[PDB]
Amino acid sequence: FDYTVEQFADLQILRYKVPEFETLTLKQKELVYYLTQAALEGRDILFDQNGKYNLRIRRMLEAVYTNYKGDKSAPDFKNMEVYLKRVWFSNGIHHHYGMEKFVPGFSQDFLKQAVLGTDAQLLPLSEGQTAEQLSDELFPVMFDPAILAKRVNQADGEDLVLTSASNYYDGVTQQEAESFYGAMKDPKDETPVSYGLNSRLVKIQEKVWKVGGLYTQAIEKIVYWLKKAETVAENDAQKAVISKLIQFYETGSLKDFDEYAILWVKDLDSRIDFVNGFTESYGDPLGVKASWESLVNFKDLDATHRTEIISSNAQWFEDHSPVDKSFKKEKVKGVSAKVITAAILAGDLYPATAIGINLPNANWIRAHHGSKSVTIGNITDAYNKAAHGNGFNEEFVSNDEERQRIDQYGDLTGELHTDLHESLGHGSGKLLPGVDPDALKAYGSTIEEARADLFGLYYVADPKLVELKLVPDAEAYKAEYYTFLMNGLMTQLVRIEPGNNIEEAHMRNRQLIARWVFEKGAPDKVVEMVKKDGKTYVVVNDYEKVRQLFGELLAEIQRIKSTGDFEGARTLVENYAVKVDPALHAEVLARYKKLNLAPYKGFINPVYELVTDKDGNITDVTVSYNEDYVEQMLRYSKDYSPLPSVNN
Ligand code: NA
Ligand SMILES: [Zn+2]
């Protein structure tokens, strides 16, 4: 199985497996199939939400690209291909992370001639429009750096509604938009609708995304496949979820959306689950309108059971903690996050995706009905598997014994450390009476993540995990110990710009732990940093002493948090967690850049096929992985692209 697909620009395309899909019942596979069809129909929505020109630009380049009769080896065509591949990845013409508009690496004269050489019937022309007129419209949008420069602008002194290229507002100023929703809100409402979540605000009124409204060509298709899924629901709770979601798309009512989210949160038992709707509001500079996304999934039973083994032993880990007894909870309950297996990704989860989903967003629904927080095990596993043999550990790990141990156990003990951090680490320990939870002020997040990390590091090495059948042998933890220390002392510097220091809380907490252990172990050479041929390597000489030092730092940090010791917190962060050595930074960056590893990853989907008999009865559902990036993007643009090119 090849987890890697291709690499271009600053992007690497991966694939993921869908483990145990074939173990589902046929009726379950059929439900997954329909839900995945409902997911794939939404792609055009996101393109249009990200920019009123995006579908025209995508479709124009697609028509040029697939019908090009010229020299495909020439630099202009190769650069146009890279640009189109970035547009597919980013669901528009802006960087999916940085928000800045792409710079075409090809000439306007080249594109003009390629466009004129394409059959006009294949171009996204409005009725009566010519190819020259389409070019006059779109070329400034693509080529002029001053036009629509940022998809989301967060700069002062500017009308962000007018200086953001996303397409949630049209012909309306920022103050008009902020005031529209400031006035709509009702502060007396204990169960408020999510005002403005599902509409374009235009001139002042809302154009709601719904059947018979804006984007209806795609929403009608989503609803069609959801109605199919409704007929094969696993149980009545899940069926009620699907039925209400259909109603939300048919009416556009935000009260229906709240009703759906309540039913969704109550559907906790079903093997299969999904998201399909206007969900997260990061694409709006005002944080009101939500981009469309979908995910279809089923519970990873083995992985969930493993996290439940950790959760059910919360009290054992608490009792045996190295922290002072006065900081220990007498009764602690562990909460396990379920692990899900993603069957397909779409919209703002595709191709750049998440490793966890925590929904719904409405705080009152979360407070009074609950929530679903899950991690996506097969996406995490694909990230991990794709990295094996990529040259990174070959370049940076001190010796072949470590490289082999990490290759064998690194993925397992890494995920176990995460499970310990997330399911028990933050929940462990208590403050003393009268201590302010905010006593550590700006250092609180760094110290709190260090605390959870140390809890996980201290216990991933415990023989208890062998007894509990979570690790296959007592040596495995050394893989996680080595990579944690290598990352925290040295190799995370690849994320720091030249001349800068450590700023982000997790990066700080990792350097804090590693540098502290390094300092305290130095008289015994517990950890060394050694140079060979001018390259630095982290060398770990006594893993047992590292465990004891992790435990000692855990006790000190627990003390700092539970007593509100701001000066102690500040001393640890400022002395260990911030300063970057310039020589080490440059050395690590030069070694890393030679590896040609792309900084951003995204995934292509598998392909599902419905097998039916003569009379249309389903006889099987198969999943296949033999499609690459170009193929899948073109197939989606051909078969799952129901929106008109202009959505006004
Ligand atoms: Na050694
Ligand atoms: Zn955390």
UniProtKB/TrEMBL annotation:
This is Dipeptidyl-peptidase III. PANTHER family: DIPEPTIDYL PEPTIDASE 3, DIPEPTIDYL PEPTIDASE III-RELATED. Zn(2+) binds at H421, E422, H426, E449. It holds the Pfam family Peptidase_M49. It comes from the Bacteria. Gene3D superfamilies: 3.30.540.30. InterPro entries: Peptidase_M49. GO terms for molecular function: hydrolase activity; metal ion binding. Keywords: Hydrolase, Metal-binding, Zinc.
